[PDB]
Every structure is written in C-alpha cells, then in structure tokens.
Homo-oligomer: A and B are copies of this chain.
C-alpha cells in the first residue's frame, strides 16, 4: 500500500500531474497501434515478395524490422522522459 512512498525520490503527485502522465501514455498507445500496423505491412510485403529473390534481398538490406524496433524503443524512452519531466523525482 502506498508503494510510492516506499520508493526513493518519488513524490506525491497532483491530479493534474497524473492526468498529463496518463495522456502521454495514451498517445503512446496510439503509436503502438501504428507500430503494429507497420509490422503487419512488412510481413505482407515479405509474403507477397516471396519468390522474388531480388525483392527479398532488398528488404533484407533495408532492415525494416530493425528500424521499427529502434523506433519503438525511442518512442518509449522518450515517453518516459516526458513523464519524468512531469513527475519531477527527487532522485538522480
């Protein structure tokens, strides 16, 4: 109970602060859907491109999945930073 007070640096937060943190998380959920949609497109692209070695080689050289992964991480890490700015913890 009241876990936050047991965590170093965590401070009591206003409703306004929580609302903002929650908004960032909600916008992120919309990004997640987009990321899933891109993944779906890539999977279809690979399937449709089966038997075209030349296109398969192009997809492999492009590395689209790695790039989608790099992006997800970035969106997520960024969300955490905006949330940290709102939360303003007292620890390093």
Chain A contacts to B: CB under 8 angstroms: 1-4, 6-9, 12-13, 15-16, 18, 20-32, 34-35, 37-38, 41-42, 58-59, 61-62, 64-65, 67-68, 70-82, 84-86, 88-92
Contact = CB atoms under 8 A, between A and B. Distances in A.
Interface SS of chain A:
helix
B88 A58 contact: yes
A44 to B, nearest CB: 11
A-B pairs with lowest CB-CB distance, top 6: A74-B78, A71-B81, A67-B85, A62-B88, A71-B78, A64-B85
A29 B1 CA distance: 26
A89 to B, nearest CB: 7
Nearest to A35: B82
Given A28-B92, A58-B88, A91-B25, A82 B41 contact: no
